[model samples]
Target: GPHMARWKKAFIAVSAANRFKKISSEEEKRKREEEEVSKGEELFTGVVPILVELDGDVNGHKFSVSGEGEGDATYGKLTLKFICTTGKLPVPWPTLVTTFLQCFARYPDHMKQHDFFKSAMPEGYVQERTIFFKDDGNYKTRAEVKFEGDTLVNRIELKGIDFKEDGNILGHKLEYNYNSHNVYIMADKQKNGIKVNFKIRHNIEDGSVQLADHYQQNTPIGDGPVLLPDNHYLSYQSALSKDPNEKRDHMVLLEFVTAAGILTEEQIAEFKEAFSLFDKDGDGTITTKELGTVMRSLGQNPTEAELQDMINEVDADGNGTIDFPEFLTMMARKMKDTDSEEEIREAFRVFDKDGNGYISAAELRHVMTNLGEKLTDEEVDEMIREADIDGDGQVNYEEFVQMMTA
Candidate 1:
């Protein structure tokens, strides 16, 4: 009679049938219901993606599932459908799989002596479950689990989702059935836009300690950003960033512009002009000797130790001199410390002598000369060749801009 319980049977049948209808139908009503079911599914699932758009708009990641089912005398046939805005959850799938495996992996009795297992569902509540994927026309298992209680119990139908170009698939849903002591309970997805199905589970065991029943655990829907552990979100974002072969240079520029609060057109032009000043000898490089001379010429007169200390902090490789890239980093850090554009300009102009919108090899050499060190033409030429943006045997203003800003 428990098997024939109307609420139980209808719950199972309606849930499964609704999912199937969702995937199978194009009607508005079915689509709306399917979305509602999907929202519930996302709520129960544990991880979700976050997106920051180009227009400065932000949207929480979402996924949906729909399917249909019919039962025979002994078994049933079920069809499922899934959709996700960002095809992949903003988490590392491989790392997640690894964590799940480690959670379920066998442990030594002494190691298991701790109460860590108590935090998990009790043993013998659910039989081992395996999820397989078709590879070369043959099924290969991708994940295996042994546990009990409620779980997102459906096959993930990735058929409707586009993974090739829409970003990573960050949210998903699953539906399935459980058989225990001659009782069959059907599990279905819930509604919530931000849930990730792979991260939660529950179990029930028999008196004999044999696997008995298991279902997807249910939770209240989440309405805002799913706050994942910092490390997890970072790792996921890292993976996503890699998948698109994202432009590293552009990424750095974007980060800089965002963090610096964007520069006005006038400020940007001024920054470009100042960048060329310290680039003495018109080479793209700014050696310590050249920098010290420039400072003294501008009446800054930084002590030898002071100049050396600045060089060491920004050299990165302890190379004694700040290279173009290193100088950019140093300037970026300094910008964060000061709010006055005039101060920034003055600090930068100490090296920019010609006012030609850039520093030249002659100007840098001039500073070194003023510092009691005479740099030979050969030395200046070599430095310029190393720092020059163009292959035309000279460091141009544009090349300087690219290196300093890039």
Candidate 2:
């Protein structure tokens, strides 16, 4: 995914730092900035992009990328440039650069195995590994560990660089294929002396973490947060967002849900049928009117303008219609709005054996033991301490979400 040579265009700018000046117009910003870079007036070798494509064609032009060098390479900052032998870029220059940065950021390791990427890093490729710990309360810690000059050839390795932070952790684990721009973390942490699992997704721009699918007893009390492996959520969020302010984070959560194995086989079939029903024209796009119909079909009343607004918001690409991908986001957004609360109700059902709206420690313990979990007295105390808020010594649906999510 990283490289082979593309020499169509070079970094005309010399050993200078990155300088991006934002313009007022939203539509023209990316293009203008890229133009500024192209006229030799710009070129940012220092940072990466919000994007990935190791191999793919835009409109029709086929480009195979390969490069060498790093920052300050007068010859070039690695084997840089684009080679388009077919149609020219169907997308903007920024889109081109954005995707390249995507490949670099998401699949740098895979690229390293390729000749193009191998040449990019003259010092040979570095393998990246990440370990997750579960005691931030609600915070995060970051550190980059690199092995210098064949230092890791041996099983016992030393990077000569290390960073650590002090924190209380009850459990930890490593992630695979996860050197993302912030990456995603799924963890089981201590809550009320019981293990509670939570999902955390990352945003590279501001390094923010989004959480979902919280925690439980021997088995998690309920469904864990919807979680995806690496940059899957990040890429989709940036792509689907329309507010220019909202990351569209909720939209991509459906993917994460699927990634977390939350979507059952029947659930997948149910969605496909829903999709087919909504795709009225079968053209893969649901018009604004179609969207309103779908909304009312789902029993939501939206005024005409409100319907238009729905189209506008979910209609990413400003295309005036809901495409398939955005359509899924629309469904996901709706699910996110209603599911957590509704799901908490379902979770209550699992424990509310007597048809009451509450679960006591004795009932939960009995149920766990019946389920073959063999509850311990310690776990008994932990569940009460965890979800029995308001001093009721029992968990209601309201406390259900808070305790698990907390």
Candidate 3:
């Protein structure tokens, strides 16, 4: 796995730096270009920093360069200094595509994490949906869709396709993995033809497969609304450009900011289990009576209005019942409210009376036994085993934080 990861990093670094060979090392242009391309093939095993600096023109679109030119430990991070040389320059097609490819290559790797990819397509279902296109006259072919493990198999006609498969039908097993966010399907790159790069989006209704072609970059790259692979509420940003030269400046500035794992599969499953625990009855909604019962169990008494207000705060449509989404929102807010380091530290201090930062078995037992609800000795040991990451018999401050946050 790491072999491929290093190869990807080196490949991107070489590709990003390809345009700068003539400018950087003029005496040996061919030799330098060859070396730059070869850097991808070799395993990037070097204590010395690998540099990528591009400052030149591929036709007339001149690109300046900045940053340290040194790639980071994982991958190369360079600022593409976009400064037009001529005052009134024309945007040529090949240069536009090249520049677009440069920016496309830098799309964040964090967005393509293993969990994100896994969240894209559900496990077992041969599901299909018609992709709505405005021009029905041009859209004749029925789009067939299915996911075979990770690769998405499809039969469709994207008007953008330039090649002929069998009646202008473009069908290929578009492979998506944890390595890259954009799944690029290039027909003839040497001939300078159609280069279709798209990100995977889960359908809203059945959680089926949908291709997000337009990644609208309105805000700065990492700051914009992210493309989450799971079942999400809204569809916002696309990481690529529709027209090659439309937003070249913003495209190059794109960087991968890890979308917080708030709706991850593990966390979502945990939330479902928790919701079931509170749900009490097999019915989905949690009524006011159930809410009151829960509060009483926790040794807190709430009057009828106070209980109604609790439901009122979360109940969006005001059906007087708390749905999963509403409960999720309320729980998320509560977690955000109390999940501060200071709050966690304060909680830890309660157990670590001497403030030595370690919570032993006796300390944990004391806290659990002193609480209104009593946990069995087995339950306390199990709890310690769950949070004791190092299995050191006792929990440190860091381990305690992990348990609390978890």
Best by TM-score: 3
List, residue by residue over 1-406, the lDDT tens digit for candidate 3.
Answer: 2222221222222221121111223324545544443332122222112222223332233444321212121232322223233332232111221121111122234433212111222221111112221211111122222233432332222222222232211222222111124433322223212223334342222333434333221111121111223311111122222236643432233223222221677656555554554466859987888766655543357788867766665677889898778766654542312335754555566566567878787876765443322456766676666668887888798887665544
Rank order by lDDT, top first? 3, 2, 1
In what order do the candidates fall by TM-score, top score first? 3, 1, 2
Candidate with the greatest lDDT versus the true structure: 3
Could you tell me how far off, in angstroms, the CA of residue 25 lies in candidate 3 after the best superposition? 64
Stronger candidate by lDDT (1 vs 3): 3
Q: Give the Cα error of residue 73 in candidate 2, in Å.
A: 33
TM-score of decoy 2: 0.21
TM-score of each: 0.22, 0.21, 0.27
Model 1 Cα lDDT, one tens digit per residue, 284-383: 6667777666555555566777676555655687767655566544434432222443432332343356665555667656644553334477665665
- How far residue 268's Cα lies from its native spot in candidate 3, in Å, is 1.6
Candidate 3 TM-score, C-alpha based: 0.27
Per-residue accuracy of model 2 over 112-137 as CA lDDT, tens digit each: 12111112121222222222323332
- After superposing candidate 2, which stretches have Cα over 4 Å from the reference? 1-269, 298-300, 331-406
RMSD of each: 28.5, 28.6, 25.1
Better of 1 and 2 by TM-score: 1
